[PDB]
Amino acid sequence: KVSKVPTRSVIPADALRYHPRYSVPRKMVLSNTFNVVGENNRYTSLKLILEKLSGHVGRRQYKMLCNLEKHYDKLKDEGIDWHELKWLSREELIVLFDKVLHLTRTERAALLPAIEAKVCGVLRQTDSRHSTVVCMNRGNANHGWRCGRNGHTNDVYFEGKAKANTAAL
Amino acid sequence: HLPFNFDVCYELGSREFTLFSSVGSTSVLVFCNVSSRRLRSVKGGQDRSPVVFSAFVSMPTSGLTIEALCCSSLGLLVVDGVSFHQGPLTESMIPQDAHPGPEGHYQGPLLNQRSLAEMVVNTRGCITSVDPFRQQESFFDGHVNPWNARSLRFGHVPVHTAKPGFSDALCHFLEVFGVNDELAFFVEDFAHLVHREEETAWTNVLKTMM
Amino acid sequence: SLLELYDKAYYFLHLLHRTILVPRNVVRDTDDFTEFLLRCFRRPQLSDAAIVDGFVEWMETSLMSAGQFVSFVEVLQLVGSYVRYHKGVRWGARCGYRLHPWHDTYCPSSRAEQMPYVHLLQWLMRAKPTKLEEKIDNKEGAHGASNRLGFTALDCGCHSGYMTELLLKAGAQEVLGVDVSPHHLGNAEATLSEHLRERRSSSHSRKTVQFVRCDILPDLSDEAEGSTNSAAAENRRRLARCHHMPSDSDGLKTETEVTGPFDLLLFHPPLPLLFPTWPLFHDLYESVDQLAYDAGRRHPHCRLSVLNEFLQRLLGRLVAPLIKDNGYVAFILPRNFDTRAILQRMSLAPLVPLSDVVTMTLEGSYTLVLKRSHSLSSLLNRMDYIQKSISAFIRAFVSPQHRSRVEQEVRDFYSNHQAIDLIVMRKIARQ
Amino acid sequence: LPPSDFPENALLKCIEKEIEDEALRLDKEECPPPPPTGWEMYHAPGTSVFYGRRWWLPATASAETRATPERHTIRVQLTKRDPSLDPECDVRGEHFPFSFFVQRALGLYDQSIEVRADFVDGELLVDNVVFHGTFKTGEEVRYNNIFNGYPGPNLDEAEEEVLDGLQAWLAERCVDDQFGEFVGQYSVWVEQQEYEMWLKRLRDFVAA
Amino acid sequence: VSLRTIAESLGAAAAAELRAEVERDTRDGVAAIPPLPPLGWRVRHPSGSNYFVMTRTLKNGVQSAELNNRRYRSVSRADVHLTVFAPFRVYDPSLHDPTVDICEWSSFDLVVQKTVPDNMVANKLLQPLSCTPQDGALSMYVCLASVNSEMRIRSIQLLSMKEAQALVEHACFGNGEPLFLELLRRRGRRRPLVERRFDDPRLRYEEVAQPQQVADEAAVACSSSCYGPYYPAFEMLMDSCGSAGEYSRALCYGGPYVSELSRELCDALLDYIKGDLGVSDQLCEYVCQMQFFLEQEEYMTWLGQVQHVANAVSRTA
Amino acid sequence: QADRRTRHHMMVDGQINPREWFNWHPKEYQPWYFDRHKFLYEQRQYAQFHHLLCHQVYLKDMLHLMRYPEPYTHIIDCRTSTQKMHRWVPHSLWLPRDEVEYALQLSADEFLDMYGFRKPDKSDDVILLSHNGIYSEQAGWEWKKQFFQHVYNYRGGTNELFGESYSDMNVSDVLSPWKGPFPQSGVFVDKWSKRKVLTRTGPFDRQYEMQDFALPDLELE
Ligand SMILES: [Zn+2]
Secondary structure, eight states: OOOOOOOOSSOOGGGGOOOTTSSOOOOBOOOGGGSSOOHHHHTHHHHHHHHHTTSEETTTTEEOSSOGGGGHHHHHHTTOOHHHHHTSOHHHHHHIIIIIIOOOTTHHHHHHHHHHTTBOOOBOOBSSSSOOOBOOOBOOGGGTTSOSOTTOOSSOOBTTSOOOOTTTO | OOOSSOEEEOOTTSSEEEEEEEETTEEEEEEEEOOSSOBOOSSOOOOOBOEEEEEEEEETTTTEEEEEEEEEETTEEEEEEEEEEESSOOGGGSOGGGOOSOOSBOOOOBSOOHHHHHHHHTOOOSOOSSOHHHHTTSOSOTTTOGGGOTTTGGGOOOSOBOOHHHHHHHHHHHHTTTOSHHHHHHHHHHHHHHHHHHHHHHHHHHHHHO | OHHHHHHHHHHHHHHHHHHSOEESOHHHHOSSHHHHHHHHHHOOOOOHHHHHHHHHHHHHHHOOSOOSEEOHHHHHHHHHHHHHHHHOEEEOOOOOEEEOOOSSOOOOOSHHHHHHHHHHHHHHHTSSOOSSOOOOSSHHHHHHOOTTSOOEEEEESOOTTHHHHHHHHSOOSEEEEEESOHHHHHHHHHHHHHHHHTTOSOOSSOOEEEEEEOSSSOOOOOOOOTHHHHHHHHHHHHHHHTTOOOSOOOOHHHHHSOOSOOSEEEEOOOOOOSSOOOOOOSOTTTOSTTTTTTTTOOOTTSSHHHHHHHHHHHHOOOOOOOSOTTOEEEEEEESOSOHHHHHHSOOOOOOOOOHHHHHHHHOSSSEEEEEEEEOTTSSOOOSSHHHHHHHHHHHHSSOGGGSHHHHHHHHTHHHHSOOEEEEEEEOOOOO | OOTTTOSOHHHHHHHHHHHHHHHSOSSSOSSOOOOOTTOEEEEOSSBSEEEEEEEEOOOOOTTSSOOOOEEEEEEEEOOOOOGGGTTTSOOOOOOEEEEEEEEEOOOSSSSEEEEEEEEOSSSEEEEEEEEEEEEEOOOEEEEOOSSSOOOOOOTTTSOHHHHHHHHHHHHHTTOSHHHHHHHHHHHHHHHHHHHHHHHHHHHHHHOO | OHHHHHHHHHHHHHHHHHHHHHHHHOBTTBOOOOOOOOTTOEEEEETTBSEEEEEEEETTSSTTSSTTTOOOOOOOOOEEEEEEEEESOEEOTTTTOTTOOOSOEEEEEEEEEEEOOSSOOTTSSSSOOTTSTTTTOOEEEEEEEEESSOEEEEEEEEEOHHHHHHHHHSSSSSSOOHHHHHHHHSOOOOOOOOEEEOOOSTTTTTOSSHHHHHHHHHHHHHHTSSSOTTHHHHHHHSOOSSHHHHHHHHSBOOOOOGGGSOHHHHHHHHIIIIIISOOOHHHHHHHHHHHHHHHHHHHHHHHHHHHHHHHHHHTTO | OOOOOOOOOOBOOOSSSOOOOTTSEEEEOOOSSOOTTSOGGGSSTTGGGGGGOOEEOOHHHHHHHHHSOOTTEEEEEOOOOTTSOOSOOTTEEEOOGGGHHHHTTSOHHHHHHHHSSOOOOTTSEEEEEOSSSSHHHHHHHHHHHTTOSOEEEOSSHHHHHSOOOOOOOOOOOOOOTTOOOTTTSOOSSOHHHHHHHSBOSSOTTSOEEEESOOOOOTTTO
């Protein structure tokens, strides 16, 4: 007898990913600072998205010329969040970009793909304790632009932690 | 909503609408080709092709015509490329009725890194597969065949990506000719209006055939 | 010498077709062309606007593969083609009539070019045959057991239907027009329709004509105990069960079509020209049809490779013989194509053989019947438009000290180096 | 082939080898694959597009006086693939795209209903229904663009009454999974006959 | 009042960008030298264009090429005309698909034609020469590519006036192709751009109009050939610049898919193009350099046109 | 300008294939201290010539030798461009840098004929100047190549004496971004080693270290 190796006809491209043990990687739970959503915890998803939009991009490591990290401090001083940035309308973004942020026309062009897709600012769990993984799925208006998948339901700021509790913040 | 001096021209059956402006001796012409596959929502959140149009700024005092490859997203405006052509707005320069403009000319440098910023989001690009002959089965179509699309630089990514402080002055220079964010909010809403009227007329024609 | 004049004249005609081109709608845009075409049509019983819309339709259906801008010499050739269509080419009496050809179609308009066709018609109808052997193919099958029963024929490279009309005038039953372009076939069908409306070639016997488009030669003859009766019964039950049983087996299209073998198989490539017509005279409005005399001479048949494949198809699954037993193949060809190479060997390079030598030494099985070289291509030499064209070409581009000798270099070339050979050969029966 | 006169002996002898083993193989058929009934197959010898053509008469109810005959036309373009992206890019899947014109009673893109289908993995995948010419709605909607005409939405997103009415319109026209298998068979024979002509035409060019 | 200060801020920045662009490529006062083409190649780049065309004519066939002539010392046929069209289309497929390990993909087309002269005596009339423009005008269109400075063949097409006549007359049952006939109905000429001559240094000052003379030698010989009215269909067929010529060559066969060919035919085709025909990896790597250099030259004219437009507005407003 | 992409074929490894072929391995190189602020010949790549560095004479020594000169302390100008020199350092002699390796090969009579001043003795003090002190440093290395026992360099000579803002215009040859380098075009090594040398871990503006060998860390897990 010669048993055939069980394969599939249609396989998603996520299953083509590499693991050194050819197994499922560990998903370590996030640190105890993310247990309560506070002002120290609110803008860590906004910081990593602006960090990735300014760093090197691709296999050839194309450096993004516009530095969007300089606008992180003035965004958190106004008290606006990445999840609160997706709730702003079109007229509220022209007021935010021109008056407060003073975003130039090329810095506005590098940030707009992150706002056009409505990226869910949820810290994904990873193999390490310090996670720099944000869920890049497109959000829907029924689930608060959180993409509604893997437990990101309308208030979830961090994967594995509690909701937003908007009465406090 | 509509800009100040812009006439619309849209005939049912073609997925194109053309806006024209004229102040002084200068003429502004905006051409758009609406995608038939799928276009992104006006809210943006949740195959989802962006609304890409062109703007022709003709100035006979300078002797050149400015073609601006623009992309409207969330009602706002980004400008992807700027090229210069000789003489005034000739009829052959506009890609209406599926005949293209001038061929084999320098397209221009990258004014913004929007296409590199979309891959951080993992938004699906215009290029579906690596094979150019695979996408050349639907030839003479900008959205499904990017290798012969004028608005997508025929698949070429140029050498120079222009300086932010330099090309911020170029985007401010075009906003005085009516290539501001107020036009791109109308083109975003009129492309969604063409996409409904084209799909409704194609359905009702198909009902009477069968 | 004549070779540099040839090269410079063809380069100048290419520059004329490249540089001075005018837009598409010449009647609407160009304000001078309308009175010009009206002058060219009033030089030789139609209204003015009818001629205007007729030339508009002529440029619509005639001009192919052209953009928004049309070459000026091409517009003059379109005017000459319109004049030649509304005037017609006259064929002399033996059978004198007029023919209406289309834009790019080959018709012999000179009597020296029509003399091989007239002599072939004389040998066909047997008016005064003083040659070696007279042909008899299927009427000999009736005489062994006449011209009233006719025969079937094959036409290779039919242009404007003049040779199909020559076959219908000499007596034939089924002729199969084969050409590369469907434009020439539509022109030949119009010529056949006017031939039937002319009441010539009387209908005591029925005649059906089929025009097919193909290459050099058509190929359509290759479609694909009790156990044989059992297989036939199973085949009948399967044809009746899968509804592929034919309810009627008349097949009238298979009757009206022309099918081989043929006993007269003829082949005539168009005669190549030494110099194109001069399109820059002052009396262009007086004679434009002679400016279109060169029309039709650029056809995909006039080659040595096409002749070699034709002869190899005639010489050799082997189901379709394509020619009847002791059938006659008649071909009318020049001494050699590519007159540039003929000018190169004139006073080195080795001597180029004639196409008669190729047709003789390739076909050792076929026996030659008629071999006549019509060397009267120098005998045209009138005061007509072709002599004015060659004197204009020798006046513009040749130095005055080296002119007349080059003129003499013209006058022997038509005398010694170019002729029209009409040759008929006959098949030999199998053993 | 003397090597002093002919420096291309590595190619001319290899291409003379490739003429014989493409003819000495017994897996190839000399006859074309037999088409279904009514279909006539044209193919120009130089190009890579072969055409199908048949006439047709629909099922017309007794309330109507006359049934108009239709004109079915098949247009198949041969698939191209880039070997410069191999072995880096994956193997491109073999599929057979074709076009199916329907004309009521004279060209291809005037008053014709055009439907594009893909024969992949033994089944037909109907993609788009493209219209050409002035049609009736419900007014007159004209589709006079032949290159960038509006091809309609993809049928994965289209409405359900549009889908089942189209497949009933397609199964009545005898366009189904067995018809697409013949297009997969005829295009293999066409590409095989073009390849032996390509090898014959290449030997005339290199040796010259 | 704001139109003057906007057009003057742009015209000052474009003059500042054009100033800072020249001093980057300038080394000790002398400007950046363009990369040198290989032996015998004459490159022509039109001003304000996206492409550059280089030609090469091998007299007496293949045996006078570069590789077949080098030997060890101190111890006829028809001429070949080469033409390498090179557009500025360069991209990397590792951005859109990270599974593909390709750093650079640059496409450029090679057109090789042959021409019989009057001096060859040995094999004149033993067979009809199919490469002649009088007989078919057979020409090989090799679509090439450069995948990480490695020349890979995309397609090998054999085009004549026959399949140009077939597409215009009988590509359908009785008619031509409806899109190929329409594309020839809209053929407007491009305005004359002044070309720059980045030739090989040894042939830079010997003859200047040599790629123009061999382009008009064939155009005379093909338009007055055995196939006369089908040459405008063949010009658009052999037109390498634009989308109408790419659709026209896609209506033809397109060659066999090369990775499915035998390994003996794959190496013999690469031995013919690289070794025998002379279209080498040195030529392939030069095209990737010259696509980079002339893109830099076209960026400076783009900076000169931003300044020229912005100065014409500020003096008008 | 405008951030030209470079035609080198360096690439980061993907997310699908395993890490293989560890007889070449790129890692990120970070040294201990910054060296970009230092003098050009005091940097990291010139450390082996650290004993070849000439002793420094300063501004106050130069002013003292301007006021009170010595007969055999030879001040020598090593500037090459005549269009960029506008003033004369006192008691200086012109010996341009690009001729120095020939100039010290002459005899004393040939030195006097080819320069107009006498050749300095090998025990005499020689003091060199330039715009920044770079041409004078290379000239001091050429002077120490010959057996000259006392050679000194004034770093920032003319730019601190006369207060100018000039430079010796050293190119520091860096390939143009159309020039494709060696390891992409070449069959000098096998395909696995060619793919593993051309890979890098991160952006290609920083420095990397190439490992010739690696063993698996079996003691972690
Ligand atoms: Zn999520």
